[PDB]
Design a protein around this ligand. Structure first.
Ligand SMILES: CCCCCCCCCCCCCCCC(=O)O
Ligand SMILES: CCCCCCCCCCCCCCCC(=O)O
Lengths: 238, 57, 255, 121, 268, 268, 60, 60, 59, 57, 125, 57
């Protein structure tokens, strides 16, 4: 009889615990492992691959492929806006269902840089230049190219290489930003503007589309397991 | 026959573990395997692609 | 000197050349090979034809129209009736092979569009009626291509496959598919896309007639467009070459 | 099958409301209750499965947004709960001016509007 | 440890890190210091909670059923399957093939049912949970001879104690579990189609070892599955639609995302 | 160990230890041996119970709520905040910024409610306490699907056992907790003002896993917080006035101290 | 089965106790500490600073 | 009093478990073993001997 | 550990491994590689659950 | 006086055991005795029989 | 390998990319730098923001028509009201900076024309 | 891997501690950190002030 004493938290079932337990099938011989291509060791490996961003999710456009196409066409004007959305991968409807967003919705804190890759899907005889800008918070969304030029921008020239990458850095005072909607952890605004005008030759379509991919950077990180809001159930299946 | 390993502490103190059962399926979970290799999913191409060079030249 | 936009592939008695190509995607970084002695389970000696089986087979072509949703192909099923490959997998009980997929589209500098070419492992699909399961004829198209549908398939007392393009028949997201080894055909950049896939499965060998390992999905993300006067018929062709193919359990032919 | 699942956002369409016998493989349709606006991605239909149980149901409608409150001259507007259907904004005045006190986003016709108009102060 | 940022300066070279072709499918490995001027800051963040284990290593209820001490339903049965619930199923479906040991935990709770029997003084109830591997003699009745559990594993729990817990090894005739299957039970491409063909985990039973009281009592057993020693391969996109069945992936079509006002709207 | 006194003698020098200027704000470091003759006595006293840890390292009830097994209120919820009670709040408010791990302990007690149902023979009640991080699916009803607690942490306790206890790490997106905040949620200096803007610790739920008896029963859960591994910065004066709200520091004005008869009174 | 014996003071909750307990959030990565001016290590540090004494606390 | 904590799976009877337990007959002297022909160590030893197969199991 | 298979080839000898007399009662110790061509595969299977103890050691 | 032995793990990590009672009939079960000799039941004959040779010659 | 028709320029938090470019003209062969101690005259310490001031500012666009004569811009005046640059030169009495000018025009292979882009020092009119 | 440290005894006998969990947030409280530095709050001035000298001279 070794004298012992039982502390609080005895005979309780904490779901996130780590103990040993007797095996129900003793001396069972498991099938030997075999080499299988594509082993995942970290979730971030999945978050660092590109995923097409449904930017044009307006009206019934979400019920087709038109949700993925950004409609850029030649116009008699300069400095107009193509698109704009906030930097909220977990909360914004734009990034919520992307691989990055689907992985973020299982956690509570996120921290790192965001890579946006824009691919031109027009004719080989079309040309253009675009301004891709990011504005940290404090003043509202820029309404014109003069205000969006003052932020972190890249001037993309459409040519042989059809893809340009805009890298949104980490300019947050907080080490980690909340995945849910919190006005304290504001992200900023991402916008795109016509730098010049689309130049199209005769007998060539003047209305083109752009596509957008999002991927996590090397510094990306997430920090609190939780349950996805999207998953649901009224009763046990079958 | 005990195992002494470092714990998960903040940046900027050891723990002791003994196995009592003889099945290797009754041990605790392996929570400290921090190894990555995203080159299979990112960059699965055959010819290497240097960052600063043009992709198609 | 060299460029990197030209690539030739030689397998068996067949060759494939390309003048405008992107890189070559190699599966999950793994090149197809044979089965090792320390990982096999079946005991009789395998057969390795290695010449007739390992060659480029060219399926039919499909016309890409301004309103095409997309097409899908089951590779174990697509080559089931074509060449010695079909005869080998017919007589044998077990099979193991890696598939290299080359998809080619031809156009001008005044045509625009974009295709996603993706290899999905274990592409289990659903049915229009929630109760019941899809029929083999609807899921498997041999010597031909199956087409997705722009609008949702109606639910009734039927065994039709749900073909919605945005759900890819798996209920998931078409954009998120990139997780699988893929490529793009941007008509302003590359004529063709090439993907090399190893043998992926949870068992070392498997019967090639009752299980389809991988599925090829060609989906136009940006619709084809051109101005009046230019060519209106633009076809898409798919060439598949089996690689490192071995078979076990010789038995009476299965039809 | 029993009665279809009750949902806060939508309401059962006519005449399914006046129906009590639902065989297997029976589809019922819903509609957005006031104000609630229909969501284009989700489809408002449920099917009685073989297990005599209805298909999974999610809110097919979302609350309508009231217009922007405006900007009261010499006054501060407090918006604790957004401007969605059922919210309440508070009207206050600066030091040195004398001022209704609150307005409620309520359904008025086919859309949602504020109740009390902006006061003067 | 996550990679630290590197300090850079201005640049007027011919190096074009930003320009690339995504036609190849190669994800661009650019860092913020390539398209702007950056400071050098050490990064102490860590990807320790993003590992496959820490992700799937949590207890999750996969089923619960109710049995009584009188009437018709005297015992309960369940055909082992992880597709009954939605949360753990969707977490597992991130991967095509997974290999993992299982830590099973059982929670049993009783309740007195409304009746009219007077003088009710119950005793402590004991429960028996018997697992039958496929091909075994399934109980046909509550006082069946099969409850002997000679070869078959069983667990006995008395109410008021800590919940029962046991560890189950990687049980599979294959080299990994399959979350998805693209094939038919028969070689002729007919019969059962889907992951149901692969499933064959046997049945689990539960009963009251004693009546306990002269009044009616209903018990409910809850099954909790915590994966450990997890190894996974081939990741795949998360389920956009809602699940409908446990034996199949059949679904109702749904839109890619949720709709906003216009393409220049900063709000939902 | 506290500093020992030093023996001194008479003095007729020009050293003026007592005379000083407090305009500088420098606290004078004089000891009794400077203004009188002293003996040398070793001091063995110790400041071991005055350390920040020993001060804040004690369990304190921060909330308690009641839920039933029938009627309307079938489950209970609480938005995590340490400002609900007065004692621990005032002990914590000694410092501006504090960093500390948390040892949570739960006490659950049931009580039979007055009714008219005959033949009442209850069973042992089991309770479930589920924590939802912000952004999670909050339970809308007691039989909600969210109770699966796959990713979410949960604790199950059977009545008659030792009270449940778990350890929570330093959770914060910042580098320390903030007891005080002098700012607004929006950059335009409008909206929520105060420490409420910083608060975002999620919600905690609790329910009966079983009805237990045909009669009414009400349970009450008590939450106890013991800080450990405490590190603190910038001390501030103790709260003279009484607290009024949990979301803000609003107070009613009160006098500096309590009044006596005259300025030469030795009694209260 | 190691034979043990339970002493009095078992399954009790003494508020001023010092035991280990399982972590609810395993392998959580905390924000790294930063230098903050004015760290308090002992309460006496606070008691050794001057404070104005309300001597004339008479009436109003 | 050594402070301990009881994990789930306490006071339960799993039929396929492996623990020590106090002997009911202490210091009992067992009969010494003797050489007996045909010792079975593995079941497979029994499965590797021939057994006549009832192939014509038709009718009576 | 169970015995691994051995790789063999064709054969035209006078060795008759298959032919035997069961009148003796001796069980024939032939392996598949004697009556066909076989590959060499290492066998990692184990007879650990077939021991007398593991068989009868259950309540 | 403890015993440290290997556990049952899959192919292609030690455990510790102490005896508390003094009767040797109270120890755990011997689950790891993998020794075979089927020559008593298969091939119990007196004259050896080589596989390749004819049985009766 | 490389081509020489692609060039990227990075200044502050801004980047400029080009797919069809000629070489880069560098003033009179001199790269801009700071003022030396052996060539200064003012005695108080200067301020050097170096990030916000040194960034790409994008003025408005002008339409090129079949009959356009041409346009001119005074650089100290053009950026006078734009960004911190304008605020810095506003409060301060003396200033010293070098200007990098990028002018971009976009067209097809069926469009024809030719622009001269020139920097005139001391263009008294 | 145990830690042996002195206890809190009166003036004018060792204890043993083992960590069982692997999170470093589950350890006991640090009750024995007796370190002080009141020079930040008392005497925060820039120029040193000797006690015996006049403060303002
Ligand atoms: C004493 C009670 C014993 C109970 C034993 C229950 C064993 C259940 C084993 C389930 C293993 C996991 C099944 C995964 C199925 C799949 O994904 O294919
Ligand atoms: C199984 C139950 C788990 C319960 C987890 C509860 C976590 C509560 C965390 C509270 C941390 C301290 C909050 C301090 C707030 C502040 O001062 O800003």
């Amino acid at each position: 009889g070794l004298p012992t004493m039982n502390t609080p938290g005895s005979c309780q079932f904490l779901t996130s615990d780590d103990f040993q337990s007797p095996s129900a099938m003793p001396q069972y011989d498991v099938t030997p492992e075999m080499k299988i291509p594509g082993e995942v060791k970290n979730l971030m490996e999945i978050a660092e691959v590109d995923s097409v961003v449904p930017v044009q999710n307006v009206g019934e456009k979400v019920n087709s492929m038109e949700a993925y196409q950004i409609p850029v066409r030649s116009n008699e004007g300069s400095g107009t806006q193509v698109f704009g959305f906030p930097l909220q991968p977990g909360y914004s409807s734009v990034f919520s269902r992307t691989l990055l967003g689907e992985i973020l919705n299982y956690y509570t804190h996120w921290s790192g840089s965001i890579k946006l890759t824009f691919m031109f899907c027009g004719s080989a005889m079309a040309t253009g230049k675009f301004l891709l800008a990011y504005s940290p918070p404090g003043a509202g969304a820029p309404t014109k190219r003069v205000d969006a030029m003052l932020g972190t921008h890249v001037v993309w020239d459409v040519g042989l290489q059809s893809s340009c990458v805009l890298c949104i850095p980490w300019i947050s005072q907080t080490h980690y930003r909340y995945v849910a909607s919190d006005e304290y952890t504001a992200g900023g605004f991402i916008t795109c503007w016509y730098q010049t005008n689309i130049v199209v030759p005769a007998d060539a379509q003047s209305s083109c589309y752009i596509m957008c991919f999002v991927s996590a950077c090397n510094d990306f990180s997430v920090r609190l397991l939780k349950d996805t809001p999207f998953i649901s159930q009224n009763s046990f299946f079958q | 026959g005990a195992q002494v390993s470092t714990q998960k502490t903040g940046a900027h103190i050891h723990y002791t573990n003994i196995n009592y059962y003889k099945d290797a399926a009754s041990n605790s979970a392996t929570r400290q395997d921090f190894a990555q290799d995203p080159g299979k999913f990112t960059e699965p191409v055959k010819d290497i692609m240097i960052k600063s060079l043009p992709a198609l030249n | 000197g060299y460029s990197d936009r030209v690539r030739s592939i030689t397998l068996g008695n067949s060759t494939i050349t390309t003048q405008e190509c992107a890189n070559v995607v190699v599966g999950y970084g793994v090149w197809p090979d044979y089965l090792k002695d320390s990982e096999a389970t079946a005991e009789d000696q395998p057969t390795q034809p290695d010449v007739a089986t390992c060659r480029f087979y060219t399926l039919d072509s499909v016309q890409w129209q301004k309103t095409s949703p997309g097409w899908w192909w089951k590779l174990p099923d697509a080559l089931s009736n074509l060449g010695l490959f079909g005869q080998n997998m017919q007589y044998h009980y077990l099979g193991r092979t890696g598939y290299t997929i080359h998809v080619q589209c031809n156009a001008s500098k005044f045509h625009q569009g974009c295709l996603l070419v993706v290899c999905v492992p274990e592409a289990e699909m659903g049915c229009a009626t929630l109760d019941n399961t899809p029929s083999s004829a609807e899921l498997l198209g041999g010597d031909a291509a199956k087409e997705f549908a722009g609008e949702p398939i109606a639910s009734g007392s039927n065994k039709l496959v749900q073909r919605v393009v945005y759900n890819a028949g798996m209920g998931i997201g078409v954009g998120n598919l990139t997780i699988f080894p893929h490529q793009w055909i941007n008509l302003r950049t590359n004529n063709s896309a090439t993907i090399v896939m190893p043998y992926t499965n949870s068992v070392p060998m498997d019967n090639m007639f009752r299980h389809n390992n991988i599925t090829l999905m060609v989906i136009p993300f940006v619709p084809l467009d051109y101005c009046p006067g230019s060519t209106t018929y633009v076809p898409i062709t798919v060439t598949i070459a089996p690689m490192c193919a071995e078979y076990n359990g010789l038995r009476l032919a299965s039809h | 099958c029993e009665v279809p699942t009750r949902l806060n956002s939508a309401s059962l369409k006519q005449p399914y409301i006046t129906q009590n016998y639902f065989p297997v493989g029976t589809v019922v349709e819903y509609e957005c209750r006031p104000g609630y606006r229909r969501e284009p991605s989700l489809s408002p239909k449920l099917t009685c499965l073989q297990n005599l149980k209805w298909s999974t149901a999610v809110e097919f409608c979302k609350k309508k947004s009231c217009p922007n409150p405006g900007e009261i001259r010499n006054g501060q507007i407090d918006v604790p709960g957004g401007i969605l259907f059922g919210a309440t904004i508070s009207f206050s005045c600066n030091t040195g001016y004398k001022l209704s006190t609150s307005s409620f986003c309520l359904i008025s016709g086919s859309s949602v509007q504020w109740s009390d108009p902006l006061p003067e102060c | 440890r996550v990679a630290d940022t590197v300090g850079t300066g201005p640049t007027n070279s011919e190096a074009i890190p930003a320009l690339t072709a995504a036609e190849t499918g190669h994800t661009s490995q650019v860092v913020p210091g390539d398209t702007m001027q950056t400071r050098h800051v050490k990064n102490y963040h860590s990807r320790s909670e993003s590992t496959v284990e820490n992700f799937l290593c949590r207890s999750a209820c996969v089923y619960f059923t109710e049995y009584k001490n009188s009437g018709s339903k005297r015992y309960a049965e369940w055909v082992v399957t992880t597709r009954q619930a939605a949360q753990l199923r969707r977490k597992l479906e991130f991967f095509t093939y997974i290999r993992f040991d299982l830590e099973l935990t059982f929670v049993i709770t009783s309740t007195q049912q409304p009746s009219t029997t007077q003088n009710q003084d119950a005793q402590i109830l004991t429960h028996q949970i018997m697992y039958v591997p496929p091909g075994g003699p399934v109980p046909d009745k509550v006082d069946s001879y099969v409850w002997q559990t000679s070869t078959n594993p069983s667990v006995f729990w008395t109410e008021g104690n800590a919940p029962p817990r046991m560890s189950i090894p990687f049980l599979s005739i294959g080299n990994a579990y399959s979350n998805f299957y693209d094939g038919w039970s028969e070689f002729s491409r007919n019969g059962v189609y889907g992951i149901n063909t692969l499933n064959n985990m046997g049945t689990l039973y539960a009963r009251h070892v004693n009546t306990g009281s002269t009044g009616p009592i209903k018990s409910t057993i809850r099954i909790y599955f915590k994966p450990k020693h997890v190894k996974a391969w081939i990741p795949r996109p998360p389920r956009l639609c809602q699940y409908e069945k446990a034996k199949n992936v059949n679904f109702q079509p749904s839109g890619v995302t949720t709709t906003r006002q216009s393409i220049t709207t900063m709000t939902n």
